[PDB]
Amino acid sequence: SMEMLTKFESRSSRAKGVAFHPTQPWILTSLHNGRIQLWDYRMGTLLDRFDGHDGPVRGIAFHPTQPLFVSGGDDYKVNVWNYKSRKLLFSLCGHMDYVRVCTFHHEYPWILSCSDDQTIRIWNWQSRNCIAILTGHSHYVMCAAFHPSEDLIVSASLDQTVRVWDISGLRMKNAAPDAIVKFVLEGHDRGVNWCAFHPTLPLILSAGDDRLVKLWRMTASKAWEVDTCRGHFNNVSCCLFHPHQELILSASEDKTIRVWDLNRRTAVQTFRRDNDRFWFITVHPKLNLFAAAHDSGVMVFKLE
Amino acid sequence: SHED
Numbered sequence: 001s002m003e004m005l006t007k008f009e010s011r012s013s014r015a016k017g018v019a020f021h022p023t024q025p026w027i028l029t030s031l032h033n034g035r036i037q038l039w040d041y042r043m044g045t046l047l048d049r050f051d052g053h054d055g056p057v058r059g060i061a062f063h064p065t066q067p068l069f070v071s072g073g074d075d076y077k078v079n080v081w082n083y084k085s086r087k088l089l090f091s092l093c094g095h096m097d098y099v100r101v102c103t104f105h106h107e108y109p110w111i112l113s114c115s116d117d118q119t120i121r122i123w124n125w126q127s128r129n130c131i132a133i134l135t136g137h138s139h140y141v142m143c144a145a146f147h148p149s150e151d152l153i154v155s156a157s158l159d160q161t162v163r164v165w166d167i168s169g170l171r172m173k174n175a176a177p178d179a180i181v182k183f184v185l186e187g188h189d190r191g192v193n194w195c196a197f198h199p200t201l202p203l204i205l206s207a208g209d210d211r212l213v214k215l216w217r218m219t220a221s222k223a224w225e226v227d228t229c230r231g232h233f234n235n236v237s238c239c240l241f242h243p244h245q246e247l248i249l250s251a252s253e254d255k256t257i258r259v260w261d262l263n264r265r266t267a268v269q270t271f272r273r274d275n276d277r278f279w280f281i282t283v284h285p286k287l288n289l290f291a292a293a294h295d296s297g298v299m300v301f302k303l304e
Numbered sequence: 305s306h307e308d
Binding site for chain 1: 306308
């Protein structure tokens with residue numbers, strides 16, 4: 001068993017995305033009502049509000065080193081903001097349906113976004129130009145993520161697949177004499193809502209409308225399903241690897257956050273809320289510190 | 305629908 005040591009809670013209308021700042025004690029929270037909040041979870045206070053979307057904002061992420069954050073909305077825009085000047089700097093337009101996720105790359109000057117329009121887009125945020133459109137999924141792309149150390153992207157789609165994309169050819173598109181799908185991971189019998197890379201091991205987690213969390217393993221030449229976490233009783237909204245313990249975390253519309261053993265895939269702990277479905281979970285890049293977005297706001301907690 |  002484990003305990004949840006709550007460090008901060010916001011009370012709001014439904015929250016969709018959360019992003020930890022890497023060095024300041026801040027979270028961004030993007031809300032179903034279109035507002036983005038910036039909270040200090042050390043003081044427990046609201047620092048700023050950012051209103052630049054119409055309708056839900058599902059994507060939200062900080063740049064790792066620049067004073068920027070990116071948001072992605074059901075109004076199809078990918079907005080880039082400066083949190084020091086408190087200005088919306090520009091909109092990146094191109095998606096033709098809801099944006100589900102947006103993140104910054106850790107080294108290249110890139111934003112990743114994915115959309116119900118079935119595409120993944122890569123944008124150069126310095127030049128403000130779309131530099132790639134990754135096509136292949138045949139339904140909403142619910143999640144996309146950069147690999148932390150290799151030129152890979154993993155994506156999850158309501159077409160029931162998880163895709164791994166080789167973007168090495170994209171980085172070298174103009175090298176002297178594009179992205180391509182490397183793996184199509186099939187197994188879920190319903191749409192896939194989320195996917196995640198392990199920070200150091202060649203592992204992938206996915207979670208879906210089949211109420212399952214699946215663990216996959218890859219090499220440079222093959223990828224395969226390893227095992228399944230069973231126990232959620234509604235759609236699984238999100239999943240991640242604990243960066244510092246051999247544990248899997250998932251969050252679900254069944255109103256629970258579940259902790260699972262990475263090696264056995266057995267239940268370790270279940271946390272429940274009485275009235276709130278969970279939509280998203282994230283972990284701080286450094287700290288044993290997690291955030292979860294739900295129907296009534298956001299919780300920031302340690303797991304002990 | 306995943307609208308929520």
